[PDB]
C-alpha cells in the first residue's frame, strides 16, 4: 500500500508555471514606478 | 493540474499602461517648477 | 468482487472544473489590490 | 457529476467592478498630495 | 452578483474636496516665505 | 484587466495650469528687484 | 460622505497672520543694513 | 482635477505692490548721496 | 487656530535697536576718513 | 495676499532726513578749503 | 525708521573748526612772502 | 528679546580713537609740503 | 575694544623727519637761483 | 524598458530661447549706465 | 531556482540614456545665465 | 527524519545573483543625476 | 507503557538543520537590497 | 515646453527708457561744473 | 514693466539750478583777484 | 420518497439577507480608518 | 427562517460614531507637527 | 452596541497640549540661529 | 491621557543657552575682519 | 537637557587671536604703499 | 580650537619687504623729473 | 610667503636711465633760448 | 417539551461584561504606542 | 455565568506602566539627534 | 500582570551615551569648515 | 544595553585631520590673490 | 575612520603654482602703465 | 462532586513565567533596531 | 508545572550580540556620508 | 544559541572601502570649483 | 563582501577632465576684463 | 565615464571673441579723452 | 556658441562721434584763452 | 591637481605688447606740446 | 591672448597731426608780438 500521488506530484508544477508567469506582469508594472519616480525627481533636480 | 493565469498574465499589462500614462501628466506639471524656478532666478540674476 | 467507482472516479473531475473556475474570479478581484495599492503609492510617490 | 459554478464564475466579475470602482476615488484623493506637495515646494522654491 | 459600491464611489469625492481645501490654506502660508524671503533680500539688495 | 487612469491622466494637466499660473505673479514681483536694484545703483552711479 | 475640513480651512489663515507678522520685524532689521550700508559709503563719499 | 491657484495667482500682485513701493523710499534716500557727493565736489571745485 | 507670534513680533524690535546701535559706531569711525581725507588735501592745497 | 510694507515705505524717509542732514555739516567743513585755498592764493597774489 | 545722524550732524562742525583754524597759520606764513617779496623789490627799486 | 550690542556700541569708539590718531601723523607729514612748497617758491621769489 | 595704533602714531613721525630733511637740500639748490639771478642783474646793473 | 524623454529633451531648448532672449533686454538697459557713467564723467572731465 | 532579471538588467540602461539625454538640454539652458550674467556685468564694467 | 532543503539552500543564491545584477543598472542610471546635477550647478557657478 | 518517541525526538533536529540552512541563502540575497539601496542613494547623495 | 518670456523681453526696454532718461538730467547738472570751473579759472586767468 | 523715473528726471534739474547758482557767487569773489592783481601791478607800473 | 426541503431551500436566503446586511454596517465603520488614517497622515504631510 | 440581525445592523453604526470621533482628537494633535515643523523651519529661514 | 471612546476622544487633546508645548522651546532655540546668523553677517557687512 | 513633556519643554531652553552662547565667540572673531578690513583700507587711503 | 558648548564657546576666541594676528602683517605691508605713494609724489612735487 | 596662522602672520612681512623694495627703484626714477624739471627751468632762467 | 619683486626692483632703474637720458636733449635745446635771449639783448644793448 | 436555557441566556451576558472589560486595559496600554510613537517623531521633527 | 476577568482587567495596567516607561528612555536618546543635528548646523552656520 | 521593562528602561540610556558621544567628534570636524571658511575669506579680505 | 560607538567616536577625529589638512593648501593658494592683487595695485600706484 | 585627503592636500599646491604664475604676466603688463604714464608726463614736463 | 483543578490552576502560572521570560530576550534584540535605526539616521543627519 | 525556558532565556542574548554587531559595520559605512558630504561642501566652500 | 554574524561583521567593511573610495573622485571634481572659482575672481581682481 | 566601486573610482576622473576643461574657456573670457579694464584706464591715464 | 565638455570647451571661445570685440569700441571712445584732454591743455599752454 | 556683440561693436562708434564732437566746442572756448592771454600781454608789451 | 594656466601665463604677454604699443603713439602726440610750447615761448622770447 | 591695439596704435598719429597743425597758427599769431614789440621800440628808438 501507498498513495499514488504520481501525477499529483508533477501537477504542482502546472500551477508553478502560473506562479512564475503572473509575476513578470506585475513587475512590468512596478517598473513604471521606478521610471516615473526618477522622472518626478528629474524635473525638480535636472 | 496547474492554474490558468493565462489572461491574468497579460492583465498585468492592462494596468501597466495606466502606470506609464499617469506619469506623463505629473511630470508635465513638474516641468513648471523647472521653468518657474529658473524664472525666479532669472529676475534676480539677469 | 470490488466496488464500481467507475463513474465516481471521473465524477471527481466534475467538481475539479469548478475548483479551477472559482479561482479566476477571486484572483480577478485580487488584481484590484495590486493596481489600487500601487496607485495608492503612485499618488504619493509620483 | 461536476459542480455548477456557472453563475458563480461571472459572479466574481460583479465584485470586480467594485474593485475597479473604489480605486478611482482613493486615487482621486491621492492626487491632492501631488498638487499640495508640489505647491508646498512651490511656495519655498518659486 | 457584484458589490454595490454605488455611494462609496461618489463618497471618495467627499474626501477629495477636503484634499483640495487644505492645500489652499497651507499654500497661503507658504506665500509668506516668498514675500519675506524676497524682502529678506530686498533690505540688503535695494 | 488594467487600471482606468483615463481622466486621471488629463487630471494632471488641471493642476499643471496652476503651476504655470502661479509663476507669472511671483516673477512679476521678482521684476521689482531688477528695477529697484538698478535704481539703487542708478542714484549712486548716474 | 466627505471630510469636514470646515474649521481646518480657516485654520490655515490662523497661521497665515503669523507668516505676515514675522516678516515685518525681520524686514525692520534688514532696514538698518540699508541705512548703515549707505552711511558706510556716506562717510567715504560725502 | 487641477489645483485652484486662482486667488493665489492675483495674490502675487498683492506683494508686488509692496515691491514697487519700498523702492521709491530707498531711492529717495539714495538721491542724497547724489546731491551731497556733488556738493562735496562743489565746495572744492567751484 | 493660528500661530501666536505675539511676543515674536515685538521681539524683532529687540534686534532692531542693535541694528540702529552698531551703525553709529561704524559711522563714527567713517567720520575720520572725512576729516583726514580733507586734511590729506588740506596740507597740499592750503 | 501681498506684503504690508506700509510703514516700511515711509520708513525710508526717516533715514532720508539723515541723508540730507549729514551733508550740510560736511559741506560746511568743505567751505573752509574754498576760503583757505583762496587765502593761500591771496597772500601770494594780492 | 530713519537713521539717527543727530550728533553726527553737529559732529561735522567739530572738524570744521579745525578747517578754519589751520588756515590762519598757513596764511600767517604766506604773509612773509608778501613782505619779503616786496623787500626783494624794495632793495632794488628804492 | 533684542540683541545685546551693549559693549559693541562703545567698542566702535575703540577704533575711533585710532581714526583720530593716525590722521595727526599723516597731517604732520603733509605739513612739509606746505613748508617746502613755499620755500620752493621762496628761493625763486625772495 | 579699540585699535592699537600705538606704534603707528609715532610711526608717522618717522616719515616726518624725511619731510623736513628733503626740503633743506632742494632749498639749498633754490639758493643758487637767488645768487645767480642777482649776479645776472649784477653784471648789467653794477 | 527606458523612459521616453524624447520630446522633453528638445523641450529644454524651448525654455533656452527664453534664457537667451531675456538677456538682450536687460543688457540693453545696462548699456545706459555705460553711457550715463561716461557722460557723468564727461561733464566733469571734458 | 533564481529570478530571471536578464532583460531587466539591461532594461536599466534603457532609462539611463534618458538620464544622460535630459541633462544636455537643461545644461544648454543654464548656459544662458552664464552668458547673460557676464553681459549683465559686462555692461556695467566694460 | 529532516527536510531535504539541499538544493533549495543553494537555490537562494540563484536569485541572489539577480539581486546584485539589477542594482548595477539602476546605479548606472542614478549616476546621471550626479552628473546632470553638477552640470545643472556648473552652468550657473562656472 | 509509554510511547517510544526516542528517535523521533532527535528526528526533530534533522529538520532543524534545514531551518537554519535555508535562512543563510535568503539572507544572502536580502543583503543585495542593503547594498543596492545604499547605492541607489549613493548615486544621488554622493 | 519653454517659458513665455515674450512680454518680459520687451519689458526690459520699458526700464531702459528710464536709464537713458535719468542720465540727461544729471548730465545737465554736471555741465555747471564745466562752466563754473572755467569761470572759477576765468576770473583768475582773464 | 519699466521704472517710473518720471519726476526723478526733472528732479535732476532741481539740483542743476543750484549748480549754476553757486558759481556766480564764487565767480563774483574771484573777480577781486582780477582787480586786486591789476591794482597790485598798477601801483608799481603806473 | 425524498425529503421535502422545499421551504428550507428558500429559508437559506432568509439568513442570507442578514449576511449582506451586517456587512454594510461594519464596512461603514471600517471607512473611518480610511479617513482617519489619511488625516493621520494629512496632518504630518500637508 | 433567517437570522434577525436587525438591531445588530444599526449597532454597527454605534461603533462607527466612535471611529469618526477618535480621529478628530488625534488629527488635532497631528496639527501641532504641521505648525511646529514650519516654526522649526521659520526660525532658520525667516 | 458601539464603542465608548468618550474619554479617549478628549484624551487626544491631553497629548495635543504637549505637541503645542514642545514647539515653543525648540522654536525659542531656533531663534538664536536667526540672531547669530545675522550677527555672523553683521560683523562682516557692518 | 496626554504625554508628559513637562521637563522636555524647559529642556529646550537648556540647549537654547548654548545657541546664544556660541554666537558671541564667532561674532567676536568676525569683528577682526571689520577691523582688519578697515586697516586694510586705512593703509592705502590714509 | 541642553548642549554642552562649554569649551566650544571659548574655542571661538582661539581663532579670534588669529583674526587679529594676521591683520597686523598685511597692515604692515599696506604701509609701504602709504610711503611709496608719498615718495612717488615727493619726487615730482618736492 | 583656533586657526594656526602662525607662519602666515610672519608671511605677511615676506611680501612687505617687496613693498618697501619696489618703491626705491621708482623713487629713483622719479628723481630725474626733479632734476630735468629744474634743468628745464635752469636753461631758461639761468 | 612674500612676493618676488627681485628683478622688478632693478627693473625700475631700466626706465630711470631713460629719465636721465631724455633730459639732456631738452636741456640742450633749452640752451638756445639762453643764447638767443642774450643775443636778442646783445643787438640792442651792445 | 423544550429546553430551559432561561438563566443560560442571561448567563451569556455575564461573560460579556468581561469581554468589554478586558479591552479597556489593553487599549489603555495601546495608547502608549500612540504617545511614544509621536514622541519618537517629535524628537526628530520638532 | 460570566468570566471573571477581574484581576485580568487591572493586569492590563501592569504592562501599561512598562509602555509609558520604555518611551522616556528612547525619547531621551532621540534628544541627542535634536542637539547634534543643531550642532551639525551650528558649526557651519554660526 | 504587566511587562518587566525594568532594565530595558535604563537600557535606553546605554545607547543614549553613544548618541551624545558620536556628536562631539562630528562637530569637532565641522569646526574645520568654520576655520577654513574664514581662512578662505581671510586671504582674500585681509 | 547601549550602542558601542566607542571607536566610532574617535573615528570622527580621523576625518577631522583631513578637514584641517585640506585647508592649508587652499589657503596657500588664496595667498597668491593677496600678493598678485597688491602687485596689480603696485604697478599702477608705485 | 577619517578621510584620506592625502593627495588632495598636495593637490592644492598644483593649482597654487598657477596662482603665482598668472600674476607675473598681468603685472608684466601693468608695468607698461608705469612707463607710459611717466612718458605721458615726461613729454609735457621734460 | 466537582473537578479537582487544584494544582492545575497554579500550573498555569508555571507556563506564565516562561511567557514573561521569553519576551525580555526578544525585546532585548528589538532594542538593536532602535539603536541601529537611529545611528542609520545619525550618520546621514549628524 | 511551568515551562522550562531556561536556556531559551539566555538564548535571546545569542541573537542580541549579532544585533549589536551588524550595527557597527553599517554605521561604519554611514560615516563616509559624513565625510564625503562635508568634503562635497568643502570643495565649494573652502 | 546566538546568530552567527561572523562574516557579516567584516562584510560591512567590504562596503566601507567603497564609501571611502567614491569620495576621492567626487572631491577630485569639487577641486575644480576651487580653482575655477578663484580664477573667475583672478581675471577680474588680478 | 564589499562593493565593487572599481570602475566608479576611475569614473570620477572622467568628470574631472571636464572640470579642468571648462575653466580654461571661462578664464579665457575673464582675460578680456584684464585687458579692457587696463585699456579703460589706459585711455584716461596714458 | 567622464563628461563630454567637447563643444563646451570651444564654446568658451565663442564668448571670448565678444570679450575682445567690445573692448575696441570702448577704447575707441577713451581715445577722445586723450585728444580732448591734450587740447584742453593745448589751448591754455600753446 | 559665442556671444553676438555684432551691433554692440559698431555701437561703440555711436558714442565715439560724441567723443569727437564735444571736444571741438570746448577747444573752441579754450581758444579765447589764447587770444585774451596774448592781448593781456599785447596791451602791456605793444 | 593644479590649474593649467600654461598658455594663460604667456597670454598676459599678448596684451602686454599692446600696452607698450599704444604708448608710443600717445607720446608721439605729447611731443607736439613740447615743440609748440617752446615755439609759443620762442615767438615771444627770441 | 593679447589686446589688438593695432589700429589704435596708428590712431594716436591721427590726433598727432592735429597737434602739429594747431601750433602753426598760434605761432603765426605769436609772430605779431615780435613785430609789434619791435615796432613799439622802433618808434621810440629809431
Swiss-Prot record, chains A, B, C, D, E, F, G, H, I, J, K, L, M, N, O, P, Q, R, S, T, U, V, W, X, Y, Z, AA, AB, AC, AD, AE, AF, AG, AH, AI, AJ, AK, AL, AM:
Role summary: Self assembles to form a helical capsid wrapping up the viral genomic DNA. The capsid displays a filamentous structure with a length of 760-1950 nm and a width of 6-8 nm. The virion assembly and budding take place at the host inner membrane.
Source organism of this protein record: Pseudomonas phage Pf1 (Bacteriophage Pf1)
Record's keyword annotation contains Signal: yes
Topology feature Cytoplasmic, residues: 43-46
Family: Belongs to the inovirus capsid protein family.
Superkingdom classification of source: Viruses
Key word Membrane present: yes
Self-association state and partner proteins as the record states: Homomultimerizes. There are several thousands of this protein in the phage capsid.
Record topology, Periplasmic segments: 1-21
A cellular component term, taken from the record's GO annotations: membrane
Subcellular location: Virion; Host membrane
Transmembrane segments: 22-42
Part of the full-length chain shown: 37 to 82 of 82
Protein name: Capsid protein G8P
Membrane topology, as annotated: Single-pass type I membrane protein
Keywords of this entry: Capsid protein, Helical capsid protein, Host membrane, Membrane, Signal, Transmembrane, Transmembrane helix, Virion
